[PDB]
Design a protein around this nucleic acid. Structure first.
Ligand SMILES: [Cl-]
Ligand SMILES: [Mg+2]
Ligand SMILES: [Mg+2]
Ligand code: NA
Ligand code: NA
Length: 326
DNA sequence: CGGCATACG
DNA sequence: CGTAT
DNA sequence: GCCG
């Protein structure tokens, strides 16, 4: 078992679902407390289990696995022996965990804002609605639409959204293309948002594109919220039988020269990308981001024509999106 | 021990 | 500060 | 919390 998540295939569904979910509770709780190192270890340990070819049934099967030390091994041991890990259950029922989860799930609210509100004594969404003077416009929109944004987005929803985005993109710039990214490109059947990557085959033609796209979507009455650039974090009005629902949609523009890097980045998973960038820098001495791959010795950028190119330039076996579910 | 990904709005 | 993978 |  290699030590980096980008070195091994990780499918969307796997054979250690309960164990990985427990470790991810502890990762999430660590994040709520600002312990980024511990969050990363618990995420990595959970991801190792997702990459295994069969269920862990005995503690000895953790021997030699990366990112399993005394703490993560104890969690697994308790789940194997008793079906439950006392630390995990204590987190789950804690007021701190439940409230931080509720508040950070709001669009426009991060850990720091949620923690401040928690320390002020706030606990519920209606507590927040009672004092709207304290909310940003983004937070107001997140709170108004919270119920819809908590409802899973389905694949049928995604196909509908892609058509309306393509229509607006086609008027904004003929020849521009729309690619589905994020979790849906990795094969998810449900999600909490939809991610799109937009480019144009002629380098430079994509400059100024996103404002033209957003203006056209807003004129069609489809935008319930946006910040108005090359990234837009929107709330769309999606038709439903006899009604509609609010859906989070992210629109990103990249020049075609950078498209492979942007596609790789926005397809994720989040952990896969962190691990890939860590691997690039620490093992290969190359600096990776959503724009390119930089050699800091030669001071040159690696031209890539495909995701396959990027994996090759990092010395990694290619993984299709469906195997990047770290 | 230091390090833990990297960007944009 | 928030957002994203 | 774990690795190198
Ligand atoms: Cl980036
Ligand atoms: Mg997404
Ligand atoms: Mg997200
Ligand atoms: Na949030
Ligand atoms: Na998104």
């Amino acid at each position: 078992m290699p030590a980096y998540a980008c070195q091994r295939p990780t499918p969307l569904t796997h054979h250690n679902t309960g164990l990985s979910e427990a470790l991810e509770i502890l990762a999430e709780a660590a994040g709520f407390e600002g312990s980024e190192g511990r969050l990363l270890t618990f995420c990595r340990a959970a991801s190792v289990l997702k990459a295994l070819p069969s269920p862990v049934t005995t503690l000895s099967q953790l021997q030699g696995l990366p990112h399993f030390g005394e703490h993560s091994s104890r969690v697994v041991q308790e789940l194997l022996e008793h079906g439950v890990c006392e630390e995990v259950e204590r987190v789950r029922r804690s007021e701190r965990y439940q409230t931080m989860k509720l508040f950070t799930q709001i669009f426009g609210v991060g850990v720091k804002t949620a923690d401040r509100w928690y320390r002020e004594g706030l606990r519920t969404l209606d507590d927040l609605r009672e004092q709207p003077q304290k909310l940003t416009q983004q937070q107001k929109a997140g709170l108004q639409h919270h119920q819809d944004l908590s409802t899973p987005v389905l694949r049928s929803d995604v196909d509908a959204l892609q058509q309306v985005v393509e229509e607006a993109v086609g008027q904004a710039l003929p020849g521009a293309t729309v690619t589905l990214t994020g979790g849906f490109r990795r094969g998810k059947l449900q999600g909490h948002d939809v991610d799109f990557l937009i480019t144009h085959p002629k380098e430079g033609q994509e400059a100024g594109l996103l404002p033209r796209v957003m203006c056209r979507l807003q004129d069609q009455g489809l935008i319930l919220y946006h910040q108005h650039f090359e990234r837009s974090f929107c709330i769309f009005r999606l038709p439903q039988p006899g009604s509609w629902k609010a859906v989070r949609v992210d629109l990103v523009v990249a020049p075609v020269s950078q498209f492979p890097f942007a596609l790789l980045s926005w397809t994720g998973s989040k952990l896969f990308q962190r691990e890939l960038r860590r691997f690039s820098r620490k093992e290969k001495g190359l600096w990776l981001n959503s724009h390119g791959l930089f050699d800091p010795e030669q001071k040159t950028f690696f031209q890539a024509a495909s995701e396959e190119d990027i994996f090759r330039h990092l010395g990694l076996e290619y993984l299709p999106p469906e195997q990047r579910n770290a």
